[PDB]
Protein backbone atom coordinates (compact mmCIF):
# COMPACT_ATOMS: atom_id res chain seq x y z
CA UNK A 1 0.00 0.00 0.00
CA UNK A 2 2.70 2.44 0.89
CA UNK A 3 4.78 1.90 -2.60
CA UNK A 4 1.41 2.46 -4.41
CA UNK A 5 1.10 5.84 -2.38
CA UNK A 6 4.37 6.81 -2.78
CA UNK A 7 4.29 6.03 -6.65
CA UNK A 8 0.45 8.08 -7.05
CA UNK A 9 2.40 11.32 -5.24
CA UNK A 10 5.01 10.55 -7.71
CA UNK A 11 2.99 10.83 -10.38
CA UNK A 12 1.14 13.57 -9.28
CA UNK A 13 4.59 15.46 -9.28
CA UNK A 14 5.48 14.51 -12.58
CA UNK A 15 1.99 16.41 -13.50
CA UNK A 16 3.59 19.13 -11.19
CA UNK A 17 6.65 19.16 -13.22
CA UNK A 18 4.91 19.58 -16.38
CA UNK A 19 2.68 22.34 -14.94
CA UNK A 20 6.31 24.23 -13.74
CA UNK A 21 7.30 24.24 -17.03
CA UNK A 22 3.90 25.67 -18.45
CA UNK A 23 5.01 28.28 -15.87
CA UNK A 24 8.09 29.38 -17.12
CA UNK A 25 6.94 30.90 -20.33
CA UNK A 26 4.33 33.40 -19.91
CA UNK A 27 6.74 36.75 -19.72
CA UNK A 28 5.73 38.92 -22.66
CA UNK A 29 6.26 37.76 -26.50
CA UNK A 30 9.74 39.39 -27.05
CA UNK A 31 10.97 37.66 -24.65
CA UNK A 32 8.84 34.60 -24.91
CA UNK A 33 11.28 33.52 -27.24
CA UNK A 34 14.70 34.10 -25.38
CA UNK A 35 11.88 31.84 -22.52
CA UNK A 36 11.40 28.59 -24.13
CA UNK A 37 15.42 28.47 -24.49
CA UNK A 38 16.03 28.93 -21.29
CA UNK A 39 13.42 26.63 -20.19
CA UNK A 40 14.78 23.82 -22.84
CA UNK A 41 18.50 24.77 -20.73
CA UNK A 42 16.69 23.90 -17.73
CA UNK A 43 14.73 20.93 -18.77
CA UNK A 44 17.58 19.36 -19.71
CA UNK A 45 19.40 19.68 -16.63
CA UNK A 46 15.66 19.07 -15.04
CA UNK A 47 15.30 15.30 -16.66
CA UNK A 48 18.39 14.25 -14.97
CA UNK A 49 17.24 14.29 -12.28
CA UNK A 50 13.60 13.26 -13.21
CA UNK A 51 14.94 9.63 -14.46
CA UNK A 52 17.01 8.55 -11.60
CA UNK A 53 13.31 9.96 -9.36
CA UNK A 54 11.26 7.67 -11.69
CA UNK A 55 13.65 4.95 -11.97
CA UNK A 56 13.60 4.61 -8.13
CA UNK A 57 10.30 3.15 -8.16
CA UNK A 58 10.52 1.32 -11.15
CA UNK A 59 13.28 -0.60 -9.17
CA UNK A 60 11.13 -0.35 -6.10
CA UNK A 61 8.26 -2.41 -7.78
CA UNK A 62 11.02 -5.17 -9.32
CA UNK A 63 11.26 -6.03 -5.87
CA UNK A 64 7.60 -6.18 -4.74
CA UNK A 65 7.41 -8.68 -7.62
CA UNK A 66 10.12 -10.95 -6.34
CA UNK A 67 8.36 -10.16 -2.77
CA UNK A 68 4.50 -11.20 -3.94
CA UNK A 69 4.06 -10.98 -7.65
CA UNK A 70 0.32 -11.88 -7.09
CA UNK A 71 -1.47 -8.17 -6.98
CA UNK A 72 1.74 -5.99 -7.09
CA UNK A 73 1.01 -6.78 -11.17
CA UNK A 74 -1.87 -4.21 -11.65
CA UNK A 75 0.32 -1.44 -9.92
CA UNK A 76 3.00 -1.83 -12.91
CA UNK A 77 -0.37 -1.58 -15.36
CA UNK A 78 -0.89 1.68 -13.24
CA UNK A 79 3.62 2.85 -13.27
CA UNK A 80 3.54 1.92 -17.37
CA UNK A 81 1.25 5.43 -17.13
CA UNK A 82 3.95 7.01 -15.23
CA UNK A 83 6.58 6.09 -17.70
CA UNK A 84 4.11 6.84 -20.44
CA UNK A 85 4.02 10.43 -19.52
CA UNK A 86 7.87 10.12 -19.27
CA UNK A 87 7.94 9.00 -22.36
CA UNK A 88 5.89 11.89 -23.86
CA UNK A 89 7.49 14.91 -21.61
CA UNK A 90 11.32 13.51 -23.34
CA UNK A 91 9.55 13.66 -27.14
CA UNK A 92 8.93 16.99 -26.29
CA UNK A 93 11.71 18.28 -24.79
CA UNK A 94 13.65 16.75 -27.31
CA UNK A 95 11.48 18.55 -29.94
CA UNK A 96 12.16 21.68 -28.46
CA UNK A 97 15.97 21.58 -28.64
CA UNK A 98 15.88 20.88 -32.25
Known sequence: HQFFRDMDDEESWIKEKKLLVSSEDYGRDLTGVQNLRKKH??????????????????????????????????????????????KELKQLAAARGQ
Do not use: M, Y
Not at 50 to 79: C, F, M, W, Y
Open 41 to 86: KRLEAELAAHEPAIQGVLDTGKKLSDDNTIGKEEIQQRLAQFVDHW
